[PDB]
Amino acid sequence: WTATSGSCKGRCFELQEVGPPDCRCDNLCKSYSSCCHDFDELCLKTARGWECTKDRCGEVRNEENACHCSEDCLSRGDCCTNYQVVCKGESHWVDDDCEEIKVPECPAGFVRPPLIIFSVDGFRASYMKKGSKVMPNIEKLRSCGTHAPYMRPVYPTKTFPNLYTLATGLYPESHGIVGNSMYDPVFDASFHLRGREKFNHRWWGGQPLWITATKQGVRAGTFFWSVSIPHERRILTILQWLSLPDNERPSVYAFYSEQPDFSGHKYGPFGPEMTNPLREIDKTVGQLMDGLKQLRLHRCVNVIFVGDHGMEDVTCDRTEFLSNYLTNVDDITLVPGTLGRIRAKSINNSKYDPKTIIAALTCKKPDQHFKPYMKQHLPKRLHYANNRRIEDIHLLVDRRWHVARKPLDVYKKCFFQGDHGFDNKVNSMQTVFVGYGPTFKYRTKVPPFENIELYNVMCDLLGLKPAPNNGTHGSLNHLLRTNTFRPTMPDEVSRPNYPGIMYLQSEFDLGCTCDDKVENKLEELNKRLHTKGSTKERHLLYGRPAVLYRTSYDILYHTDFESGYSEIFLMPLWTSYTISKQAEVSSIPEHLTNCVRPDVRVSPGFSQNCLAYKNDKQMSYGFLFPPYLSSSPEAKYDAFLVTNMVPMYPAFKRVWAYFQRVLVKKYASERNGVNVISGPIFDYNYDGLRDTEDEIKQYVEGSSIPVPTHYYSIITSCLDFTQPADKCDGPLSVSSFILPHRPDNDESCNSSEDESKWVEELMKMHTARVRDIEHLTGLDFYRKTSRSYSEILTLKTYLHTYESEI
Numbered sequence: 001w002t003a004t005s006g007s008c009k010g011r012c013f014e015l016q017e018v019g020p021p022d023c024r025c026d027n028l029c030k031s032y033s034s035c036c037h038d039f040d041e042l043c044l045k046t047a048r049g050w051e052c053t054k055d056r057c058g059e060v061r062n063e064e065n066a067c068h069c070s071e072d073c074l075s076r077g078d079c080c081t082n083y084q085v086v087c088k089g090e091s092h093w094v095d096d097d098c099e100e101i102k103v104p105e106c107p108a109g110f111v112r113p114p115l116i117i118f119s120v121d122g123f124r125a126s127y128m129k130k131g132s133k134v135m136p137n138i139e140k141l142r143s144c145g146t147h148a149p150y151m152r153p154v155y156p157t158k159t160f161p162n163l164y165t166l167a168t169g170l171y172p173e174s175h176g177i178v179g180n181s182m183y184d185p186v187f188d189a190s191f192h193l194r195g196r197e198k199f200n201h202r203w204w205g206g207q208p209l210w211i212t213a214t215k216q217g218v219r220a221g222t223f224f225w226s227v228s229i230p231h232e233r234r235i236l237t238i239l240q241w242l243s244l245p246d247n248e249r250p251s252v253y254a255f256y257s258e259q260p261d262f263s264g265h266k267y268g269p270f271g272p273e274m275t276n277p278l279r280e281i282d283k284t285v286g287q288l289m290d291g292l293k294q295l296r297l298h299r300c301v302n303v304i305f306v307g308d309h310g311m312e313d314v315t316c317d318r319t320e321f322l323s324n325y326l327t328n329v330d331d332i333t334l335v336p337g338t339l340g341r342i343r344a345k346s347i348n349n350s351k352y353d354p355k356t357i358i359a360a361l362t363c364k365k366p367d368q369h370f371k372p373y374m375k376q377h378l379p380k381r382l383h384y385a386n387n388r389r390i391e392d393i394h395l396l397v398d399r400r401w402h403v404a405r406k407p408l409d410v411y412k413k414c415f416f417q418g419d420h421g422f423d424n425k426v427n428s429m430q431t432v433f434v435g436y437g438p439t440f441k442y443r444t445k446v447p448p449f450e451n452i453e454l455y456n457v458m459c460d461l462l463g464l465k466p467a468p469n470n471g472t473h474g475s476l477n478h479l480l481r482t483n484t485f486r487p488t489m490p491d492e493v494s495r496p497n498y499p500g501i502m503y504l505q506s507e508f509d510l511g512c513t514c515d516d517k518v519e520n521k522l523e524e525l526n527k528r529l530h531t532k533g534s535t536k537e538r539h540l541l542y543g544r545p546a547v548l549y550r551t552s553y554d555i556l557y558h559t560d561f562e563s564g565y566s567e568i569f570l571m572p573l574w575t576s577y578t579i580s581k582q583a584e585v586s587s588i589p590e591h592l593t594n595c596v597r598p599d600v601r602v603s604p605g606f607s608q609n610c611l612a613y614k615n616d617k618q619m620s621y622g623f624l625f626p627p628y629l630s631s632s633p634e635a636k637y638d639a640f641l642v643t644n645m646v647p648m649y650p651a652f653k654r655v656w657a658y659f660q661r662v663l664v665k666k667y668a669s670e671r672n673g674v675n676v677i678s679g680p681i682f683d684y685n686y687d688g689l690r691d692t693e694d695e696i697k698q699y700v701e702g703s704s705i706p707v708p709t710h711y712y713s714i715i716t717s718c719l720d721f722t723q724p725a726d727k728c729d730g731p732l733s734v735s736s737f738i739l740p741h742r743p744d745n746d747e748s749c750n751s752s753e754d755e756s757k758w759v760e761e762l763m764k765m766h767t768a769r770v771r772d773i774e775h776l777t778g779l780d781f782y783r784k785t786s787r788s789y790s791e792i793l794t795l796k797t798y799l800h801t802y803e804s805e806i
C-alpha cells in the first residue's frame with residue numbers, strides 16, 4: 001500500500017528515491033501507482049504547450065505553464081527550449097555553422113563535461129541516409145560529430161537485452177536479460193514486458209553505468225522514463241537538472257524514445273507512415289540542443305545518439321508453426337516470434353526428449369525458415385548460452401519470418417508489419433551511433449563497432465573505472481579527442497620450450513606408419529636450419545601468440561609452418577603459416593595417404609597415437625597445416641607429423657578439407673597472400689572461455705587425446721591488397737571463424753551436395769572476432785606489429801559479417 005497523502009511540491013522528478021516517506025515523485029512512481037495526489041498537477045504541467053510565442057515574451061511568470069517565457073526563466077532554468085530564439089533574436093542550434101569543439105566550454109563550477117545519452121528504440125542504421133532530408137538536427141550531430149555507418153546490437157536484437165548491454169558492457173548471457181520474456185528456473189519466476197516482476201532486482205546483473213557513476217562519486221539522472229511522460233517534459237526535466245547547484249547536479253543523463261520502434265512495428269521499417277516519427281524525433285533533438293545552447297552548454301556536453309536495434313519487414317503470413325513439425329506440440333512451451341526458445345511444458349514429463357524434438361525440426365521443409373540448435377551449437381559470436389534463463393533448444397529464425405507454436409497463437413492472440421530480434425549480423429537489425437561534443441572527434445567517421453564496447457567509452461567520458469565487462473577497452477580510442485584508455489598488452493604467463501631432436505624413431509610405439517624411409521650435405525644443412533626457425537619470419541608475421549595461462553608447451557619450427565604444441569592437450573594450441581598469392585595446391589601422394597610420422601623433438605608420452613584413431617570408429621583425424629599447401633615434395637613430409645594431427649569427425653573433415661584445399665588458396669589470390677593461424681578450441685561448458693583439462697567431456701576412445709568442440713582460423717592480410725601479406729607496411733585486414741566440431745552436418749541442409757554448395761555458407765555463419773578466439777583459447781595474438789596497440793585492439797574486435805553494404 002502507498003499512503004499517497006504526501007506532496008510533490010518542490011520534489012518533482014526527485015533523483016533520490018523514497019520508500020519510508022510514503023509518496024513518490026520520480027519518473028517511475030507511475031509504474032508503481034505510487035505518485036502523490038498532486039504529481040500530475042505539479043510535475044506534468046501542459047498549460048500553453050511547449051513553445052514560446054512573440055506575445056509570451058517578457059510575460060509575468062505563471063507557475064501553471066508547462067514552460068516559461070519570462071525574463072527570470074534562464075536562471076531558474078525552465079524556459080521553453082525556443083525562448084531565446086523567439087524572444088531574444090537567437091538562431092536555432094541547427095541553423096548555426098558547426099565549429100570544432102576543441103575543449104569543453106562549460107560554465108564555472110562544472111567539474112567535467114556532462115554526458116547525455118539520447119537513445120532511440122528501433123532506429124535502423126539506414127534511417128541516417130534514407131531519412132536525412134527530414135532529420136536536420138540529427139544530420140548535423142552526425143556530420144559534425146563522430147559517427148559509425150552502423151552499430152552492431154547484441155542477440156537477441158530486442159529492446160531490454162540491448163539497452164542493458166549498452167548500460168553494462170555485457171553480453172545478455174552475463175547480464176541476465178536474455179530476452180523480452182524469460183523464465184528463471186532457479187527462482188521459478190517469469191519476466192514479462194508487462195507487469196511487476198521485471199522490476200525485481202534479481203533479473204539485472206553486472207553493474208550498469210548509473211551504479212558505476214554513483215559508486216565513484218559521479219551523480220546520475222534517472223535512466224528509466226514512464227511511457228506517459230511526454231518527450232518535451234523529458235527534455236525540460238534534463239534541462240532543469242542541468243541547472244541544479246554544482247553539488248546536486250548529475251553529470252550523466254539518459255533520454256529514451258519509444259519511436260521509431262512503435263510505428264515501425266505497425267507500418268514496417270519504411271512504411272510511408274514512418275516519415276512523421278522520424279520528423280518528431282529530430283524535433284526533440286532540436287529542443288535539446290536549443291535548450292543546451294540557451295544554457296551555454298552546447299559546446300560543453302557530450303551527446304551520444306544511439307539505437308538499441310533496427311527493424312525488419314515481418315507479416316503474419318510469414319510464420320512457421322511448430323504444429324506442422326511436431327506431433328507432441330502440447331508438451332512444449334515456446335518463447336515465440338523472431339527467435340524461438342523451447343522447453344518442456346512440465347518438468348514431470350519423463351517422455352520429453354530434446355533429441356527427438358531437434359530431429360523433428362531439422363531440415364523438414366524445402367525452404368524451412370528457421371533452424372533448430374542446442375544452445376551450445378549456436379554460432380559462438382552470438383555469445384548466447386551461458387545462462388540458465390536460455391533454454392537448451394533454440395530456433396534461429398530467418399529474417400522477415402516468425403515462429404509460433406500453432407496457428408491459433410497468431411490469429412487468437414494482420415496487425416504488425418515490422419519486427420526485430422533476429423541474428424545480430426542481419427543488416428536490417430543494425431542500429432546507429434553518433435557522438436558529439438568536446439571529448440568526441442570532429443567530422444570523423446569510424447568503422448562499425450559492437451554496442452558492448454560503449455560502456456567503456458561512457459566510463460572514459462565520465463572519468464570512471466568501468467566494472468569488468470565484455471568490451472575491449474581501448475578498441476574505441478579512435479572515437480575520442482582525449483580521455484583515451486591506454487592499456488598494456490597482457491603479460492605472457494607461460495614461456496615456451498624449444499625442443500631439438502631428442503628421440504629415436506624406435507622409441508615410438510604409436511601404431512602409426514609412413515612410407516617415408518627413402519633417402520646430401522647441401523639440403524641437410526638446409527632442413528636443419530628450417531627446423532631451427534629460419535623461415536619463421538615468413539610464417540609468423542605478427543610475432544608468436546602469448547600464452548596467458550599456466551601450461552607446458554613447445555614451439556616447433558618447420559619449412560612451411562610454425563606451431564605452439566601443447567604437451568597437456570597433446571596437440572597444437574596454434575599453428576601459423578603464410579600462403580602467398582603465387583602459392584600452389586598439390587595433392588597428397590599415394591604413398592603418403594595414411595602416413596603419420598613420429599616427431600623426434602617430442603616424447604612418445606606427449607604424442608597422439610594412430611591406434612586410438614583406429615579403435616575409435618566415430619573419430620578420425622586431420623591436420624592443422626594442410627599437406628595440400630606444402631612448398632615442395634620434401635617439405636610435405638612435415639605436414640604428416642603426429643604433432644600436426646588433430647581429432648576430427650569424418651563429417652567435419654568434409655568442411656575442413658574444403659577450407660584447406662580450396663578456400664585458403666582462394667583467399668590468398670583475392671587478398672594478395674594470407675597468413676593463417678589455426679587451432680583447436682575446447683568449450684564444453686559453453687561459457688565462451690578456454691576449458692581447463694578437467695572440463696573436457698570427450699576423448700578419443702582409449703586415450704587422453706581431448707576432442708575439441710571447435711576449430712578456429714584467423715586469416716590476416718594487408719588492408720592495402722596491392723601489398724603482399726608478408727610485406728605489408730600499414731593496417732591489417734582480418735577475417736576469422738570458429739567452426740563447431742560436429743559429428744554430423746545436420747546444421748547444413750544442403751550437405752549431401754558438393755562442398756562448393758554448402759561449406760562456405762556454414763563458415764560465414766560461424767564468422768568470429770579474433771577477440772572471441774582469444775577468450776576461447778587463452779592466447780593473445782598480434783603481439784609484434786608496427787601498429788598502435790589501440791589499432792590492434794580495433795582489429796581484434798572486427799567481425800566480417802558477409803552482408804552486402806548497409
Ligand SMILES: *[C@@H]1O[C@H](CO)[C@@H](O[C@@H]2O[C@H](CO)[C@@H](O[C@@H]3O[C@H](CO[C@H]4O[C@H](CO)[C@@H](O)[C@H](O[C@H]5O[C@H](CO)[C@@H](O)[C@H](O)[C@@H]5O[C@H]5O[C@H](CO)[C@@H](O)[C@H](O)[C@@H]5O)[C@@H]4O)[C@@H](O)[C@H](O[C@H]4O[C@H](CO)[C@@H](O)[C@H](O)[C@@H]4O[C@H]4O[C@H](CO)[C@@H](O)[C@H](O)[C@@H]4O)[C@@H]3O)[C@H](O)[C@H]2NC(C)=O)[C@H](O)[C@H]1NC(C)=O
Pocket residue numbers: 170171173174175176202203204205206383386387388468469470687688689775
Ligand atoms: C563477459 O564479462 C564478464 C564480466 O567480466 C565475465 O563474467 C565473469 O566471468 C567470471 C569467470 O567465469 C566470473 O567469475 C566467477 O565469479 C563467481 C562469483 O560471482 C558473483 O559475484 C560477482 C561479483 O559481484 C557477480 O558479478 C556475479 O554475478 C553473476 O551471477 C549472478 C547470479 O548470482 C547474476 O545475477 C549475474 O548476472 C552474473 O551471472 C553470470 O555469471 C555467472 C557466473 O559467475 C553465471 O552462472 C551466469 O549464468 C551469468 O553468466 C556473482 O554474483 C565465483 O563464484 C566464481 O568462482 C568459482 O570458480 C573459480 C574459477 O577460478 C574457482 O577458483 C572458485 O573456487 C569458484 O569455484 C567454486 O564454485 C563453483 C561453482 O559454484 C564450484 O563448482 C567449485 O567447486 C567451487 O566451490 C568465479 O570467480 C564472474 O562472476 C563473471 N561476472 C559476470 C558479471 O558475469 C564473462 O566471462 C565475459 N564473457 C566472455 C565470453 O569473455
Ligand SMILES: O=C(OCc1ccc(OC(F)(F)F)cc1)N1C[C@@H]2CN(C(=O)[C@@H]3CCc4[nH]nnc4C3)C[C@H]2C1
Pocket residue numbers: 117119159160163164165166167168193194195209223224225226254255256
Ligand atoms: O527510459 C527508458 O530507458 C532509458 C535508458 C537509456 C539508455 C540506457 O542505456 C545506457 F545506459 F547505456 F545509456 C538504458 C536505459 N526506458 C527503456 C524501457 C524499454 N521499455 C519497454 O520495453 C516497455 C516495458 C513496459 C511495457 N509494457 N508494455 N510494453 C512495454 C515496453 C520501457 C522503456 C523506458
Ligand SMILES: [Ca+2]
Pocket residue numbers: 682683684685686687688689690691
Ligand atoms: Ca569453457
Ligand SMILES: [Cl-]
Pocket residue numbers: 156158178179180181335
Ligand atoms: Cl525474447
Ligand code: NA
Pocket residue numbers: 613614615616617618619620
Ligand atoms: Na577412427
Ligand code: NA
Pocket residue numbers: 745746747748749750751752
Ligand atoms: Na545436412
Ligand SMILES: [Zn+2]
Pocket residue numbers: 122159261262265420
Ligand atoms: Zn520493438
